[PDB]
Amino acid sequence: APADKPQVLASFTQTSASSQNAWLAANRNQSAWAAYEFDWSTDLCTQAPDNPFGFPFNTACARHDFGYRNYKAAGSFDANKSRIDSAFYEDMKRVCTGYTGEKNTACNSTAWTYYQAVKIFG
């Protein structure tokens, strides 16, 4: 892999909107990143808790899978897990800002439940 792989992986796995945006562009253009040999596999939100209101969290789940899978492959998962989990929460919260009133509260509650269901592991 290129010498800056660790730095690229870090840049894709921050809590900021700019990190998410960078990752989303790379996800649309995975082949442009072929040199890096990232694991692009994802189950979307199929292994997450129920989503009874149908909020669109798939891209949030996909970036969380990317952080987990790529840090595991590097041998440094434990040190990075918390940030990756937080980034997932932040990505879901960004979806929720598109709603008001009760649906805002419900979206944030679903986001919290999704986040806690990964935080239980450490």
The domain that holds 14 is classified in CATH as: 1.20.90.10
Burial tier of 97 (Cβ tally within 10 Å: 0-12, 13-18, 19+): exposed
CA pair distance 64, 118, nearest whole angstrom: 10
Method of determination is: X-ray
What is the resolution in angstroms?
A: 1.0
Q: What is the distance, to the nearest Å, from the Cα of residue 121 to the centroid of all Cα atoms in its chain?
A: 16
Residues 92, 57 contacting (CB under 8 angstroms): yes
From the list 55, 64, 71, 110, the catalytic residue is 64
> Is-catalytic flag, 31?
no
Domains of the chain: total:
1
Residues 11, 5 contacting (CB under 8 angstroms): no
- What is the domain range of residue 14? 1-122
